[PDB]
Structures are given as structure tokens and as C-alpha cells.
């Protein structure tokens, strides 16, 4: 209907102006910019994009600004945008005037690839800075001052491919969804970068939606079936344990706690947030039993439970690198949920979370005024949480409008 197009646009246009008013009321710092790329760069909306913050932040005491560069994925080239935020956030008309007028120059470009996922690693052993995983399952290691990658893993061009690196940055895991069993590809990233350490096909699963490492010798895998398959670095064809959750919908992704080797975060299409301990799943034992898909949900009671906004399918989660209670959640429509389980740890200290408890646990909800439209580009990797800057996150929409901000939780630390 023609009114239906004037329906959703008009409602959001007021709702955006609603969130536009409380912008100075709910955040400590919020900024937006349009990426300015040189000639030849693809500016399409369906352009596959990703962003992740770098660790080479800069201080500016003479101007009170904090420089935070970010690596921007635009097709085959990687752009670098230095975000200007206030210095009072952790420890600006002209600072914005530069980046908006600075033509983004592609520092690293991988011709023949589509940037799907990237991981900035500070590894002085290989002297590398960024390792981007192409849409064709390919990865390329580029060092400082190098326009072309120094090492790459090139697969024959034909989907979904996810890449996760070990805690010591020595082992790389790569998924290859083949249209043919899904494969989890192991690549050593210490001395022999680019060579496959192993190949373990997962029979009966077509795609691996997410890859996440639990430790330096333990890894996990997630298929479309929502069954968590954790495979070990040891010499074993099958997973040592299998985690199956069908109570709160089909599982979408997972996250590993940086301080709790046993406690992890789970997500499902049903909008429920689950926190589970690895020792309990392994306590079941004997994953070598017949893989009865017909068997009901495993009787595994998780540690704690939460819910997203209106049961929104949680597509991504990442625990903070500075705080063990601050959690990042990604909804289906791009909204960034701010979760801080500090209240649950108190109710667990005096003795299911109540509706008021889950109401108190959410720090904030960043929808960007409904401007984060649901395009064809998956916004899973289009969100970057600062590992060294508290509550500072960056987002990339299909409109190219790059967003970086820090929310105000109101709790004076």
C-alpha cells in the first residue's frame, strides 16, 4: 500500500525526533559522521561492511579530545577513521570538521575479497595489525605500512564464514559453509600463518553461523540447528561435548566470558538471554552417544536468564574486556542492548529474575532513532565495543551513517 510507505516512515520520523530530543539526556557522548571515501569506492547500501576498534588510541590534552581510530570494511579495501570523542569520557566542532573533510584513504585492500569479519590483533610475533576474513572463507594478514597483505589463506571461489582467534593469538578457527558438510578450519597464527593446521568437516550441518573460542585449547561451533558443538584442539573427529538448547527458541550465537572460563553467554531467536556454566554441560559426559536429534532438550538448567526487548532475536553478544558484568547484546533490527548483570550478582548474594529485575539489569537500549534499518547487510560484525573505553561502542548501518557513542547508565561509579 502507498500509505504503508508513508506509515512506517512517518511514525519513525517522529520517533526519531523523540529520541533526538533526549540525546543530551541519556548519553555522555554521542557522535555521527558520514564516511567520505575516494573515487571508485562502492557506496551501495547492500555493501557488506564491518568495523572493529583499534588499540592505538591517542590522547590530546591541549584540546581535551580522545582519538580512537577504527578500521572500516568497505568491500575489498579497509578504511581507517579516527574517531574524535571527549577526553572526559575515560580519564568539538573542529574535530568533527577534520574527519568529515578527510577523504578516507584505503590503507589495506584485499582485491578479490568481500570483507565479512575482521579481528585487530596486537601480536608482535607476526608483527600484524589486522586479519580480515573474506566472504569466501579467505583470511589475509596485513602488517603496518603494507598496502597488500603479507600472508593470506585463499580458498577457491564458489554464504557464511566466521573467524575466531585463540586467546594467545596462536590458533585461528575458520568456518566454510559449502552448498557437502560444514568445515571448521584450523590455522596456526604464530609462525606458519596461512597454512591449515587441520580440517574437521561437520557432517549433517551446512553452515556455521558463529565461531568463538572458549580458551587456548577449547573451541566452539554453532550451526543453523541451534546446537552448540564444542570441538577440542586434541586429535578427535567429533566434539567432546554437545550443548543443545531448544527451550527458548533456536540458538543463534554465543559469547565467552573473558574472566570466567566456565561461564558463557548464549543467545536464541526467542529473545531470551542465557548464562550457562561449561562445567555443567561437560558434567553430562559421553558425547559419543548416538546423536539422537529426536531426543528432547537436555535437562541443563542455566545459571541465569534474561530477555531482550519484545523477544527480539539476539544475533550477537560480546562480554566487556574491562568489566565482568557489562554485557553487549545485538538484536535483530540492529538495536544495541546494554546489559549489566551487577544486580543479579546481588540477588544471588543474599539467597529466575523478575520483570522488575530484568528491568533494572538493562543499562540502556540504543536504537539510533529507528534509523538502523533492516537491510541485506548483516549488522553482526557492524558493531564494535571498545575494549579499553567503558561503554563506548561504534555501529555501522546500511545508510553509511557511522555512529559512535557512550551511554549514560546514571550510576556514578
Amino acid at each position: 500500500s502507498t500509505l504503508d510507505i508513508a506509515e512506517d516512515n512517518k511514525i519513525k520520523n517522529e520517533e526519531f525526533k523523540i529520541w533526538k530530543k533526549s540525546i543530551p539526556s541519556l548519553y555522555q557522548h554521542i557522535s555521527s559522521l558520514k564516511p567520505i571515501f575516494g573515487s571508485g569506492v562502492d557506496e551501495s547500501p547492500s555493501t557488506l561492511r564491518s568495523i572493529v576498534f583499534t588499540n592505538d588510541s591517542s590522547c590530546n590534552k591541549s584540546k581535551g579530545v580522545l582519538s580512537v581510530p577504527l578500521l572500516y570494511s568497505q568491500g575489498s579495501e579497509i578504511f581507517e577513521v579516527d574517531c574524535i570523542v571527549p577526553l572526559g569520557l575515560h580519564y568539538y566542532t573542529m574535530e568533527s570538521q577534520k574527519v568529515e573533510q578527510t577523504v578516507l584513504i584505503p590503507k589495506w585492500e584485499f582485491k578479490g575479497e568481500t570483507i565479512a569479519k575482521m579481528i585487530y590483533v596486537d601480536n608482535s610475533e607476526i608483527n600484524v595489525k589486522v586479519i580480515a576474513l573474506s566472504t569466501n572463507g579467505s583470511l589475509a594478514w596485513f602488517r603496518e605500512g603494507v598496502k597488500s597483505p603479507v600472508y593470506t589463506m585463499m580458498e577457491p571461489s564458489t554464504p557464511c564464514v566466521d573467524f575466531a582467534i585463540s586467546n594467545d593469538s596462536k590458533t585461528l578457527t575458520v568456518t566454510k559453509e559449502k552448498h557437502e558438510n560444514a568445515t571448521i578450519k584450523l590455522i596456526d597464527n604464530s609462525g606458519k600463518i596461512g597454512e591449515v593446521l587441520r580440517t574437521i568437516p561437520v557432517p549433517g550441518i551446512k553452515n556455521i553461523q558463529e565461531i568463538k573460542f572458549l580458551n587456548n585449547q577449547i573451541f566452539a561451533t554453532c550451526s543453523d540447528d541451534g546446537i552448540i558443538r564444542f570441538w577440542g584442539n586434541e586429535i578427535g573427529k567429533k566434539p567432546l561435548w554437545i550443548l543443545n538448547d531448544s527451550l527458548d527458541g533456536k540458538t543463534t550465537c554465543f559469547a565467552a566470558s573473558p574472566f570466567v572460563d566456565t561461564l558463557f553467554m548464549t543467545g536464541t531467536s526467542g529473545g531470551a538471554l542465557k548464562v550457562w556454566d561449561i562445567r555443567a554441560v561437560i558434567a553430562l559426559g559421553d558425547a559419543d552417544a548416538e546423536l539422537n536429534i529426536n531426543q528432547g532438550h537436555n535437562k541443563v538448567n542455566e545459571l541465569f536468564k534474561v530477555h531482550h526487548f519484545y523477544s527480539e532475536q539476539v544475533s550477537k553478544i560480546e562480554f566487556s574486556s574491562i568489566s565482568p558484568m557489562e554485557v553487549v547484546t545485538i538484536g535483530g533490527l540492529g538495536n544495541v542492548y546494554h546489559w549489566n548483570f551487577e544486580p543479579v550478582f546481588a540477588i544471588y548474594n543474599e539467597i529466575i529474575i523478575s520483570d522488575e529485575l530484568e528491568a533494572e539489569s538493562m543499562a540502556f537500549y540504543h536504537t539510533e532513532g529507528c534509523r538502523r534499518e533492516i537491510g541485506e547487510n548483516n549488522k553482526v560484525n557492524t558493531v564494535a565495543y571498545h575494549k579499553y573505553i567503558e561503554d563506548l561502542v561504534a555501529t555501522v548501518d546500511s545508510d553509511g551513517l557511522l555512529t559512535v557513542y557512550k551511554p549514560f547508565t546514571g550510576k556514578v561509579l
Partner: peptide
């Protein structure tokens, strides 16, 4: 009370 691109504006109303 319950109802009495067309579904798009409908899904937005339930959330608010």
C-alpha cells in the same frame, strides 16, 4: 486493544 509494508507499521505498534 488488539487490532480491528502494511504489516510493517503493524509490527512497530506492538513494540512501543
Amino acid at each position: 486493544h488488539p487490532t480491528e509494508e502494511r504489516l510493517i507499521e503493524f509490527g512497530q505498534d506492538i513494540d512501543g
